Structure formats: structure tokens, C-alpha cells
């Protein structure tokens, strides 16, 4: 992961490492690649709700639980 593909993933990238407690993370990763519970990725979806007023529910975080799929759920 030397860079995201859109600032949408740029934000979900920061949130991802913060709420998930990681440092870097890739793009189409998997919120359950090495964490615990789902309250974390959800926190990320909340990062999408504050950063944007986009509808990103938990079921959407489950249908597309990653940075590219999330930033894409928002970014597009």
C-alpha cells in the first residue's frame, strides 16, 4: 500500500488505521484482516457519515467491508 486511488479511500484509509488501530492498511483490505469485533469497521462507516452525509449502514460495511469498496460506496 504505497498510496490510495482516491481521496475517498484517503480518508477511509486514515480512519481505517485509527479506528482499527493499524498503520498503513491497503485498499480492498478486509475490516476483519486482523482486528476484533465489528464495532471498529462500523466506527469507520461512522467516519463516512461525519466526513459525508452518505448512507453507509453496517450491512453495507458487510457487503463491502474494505477501503476501496467503502470509499467507492461514498465516492460513488
CATH number at residue 67: 1.10.1200.10
Q: Which residue is associated with the grid cell 479506528?
A: 19
In total, how many domains does the chain have?
1
Residues 6-37 as b or e (16 or more Cβ within 10 Å = b)? eebbebbbebbeebbebeebbbebebeeebee
Question: Alpha carbon 44 to chain centroid distance?
Answer: 5
State which residues form the domain around 72.
Answer: 1-76
Task: DSSP letter for 2, please.
Answer: -
Experimental technique of record: NMR
Q: Which of 30, 27, 31, 33 shows the shortest CA–CA distance to 6?
A: 27
- State the Cα torsion 37-67-46-17 to the nearest 10°: 70
Sign of CA dihedral 62, 66, 67, 71: negative
Amino acid at each position: 500500500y504505497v498510496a490510495p486511488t482516491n481521496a475517498v479511500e484517503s480518508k477511509l484509509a486514515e480512519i481505517w488505521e485509527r479506528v482499527l488501530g493499524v498503520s498503513g492498511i491497503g485498499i480492498l483490505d478486509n475490516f476483519f484482516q486482523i482486528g476484533g469485533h465489528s464495532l471498529k469497521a462500523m466506527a469507520v462507516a461512522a467516519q463516512v457519515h461525519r466526513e459525508y452525509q452518505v448512507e453507509l449502514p453496517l450491512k453495507v460495511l458487510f457487503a463491502q467491508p474494505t477501503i476501496k469498496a467503502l470509499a467507492q460506496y461514498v465516492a460513488t
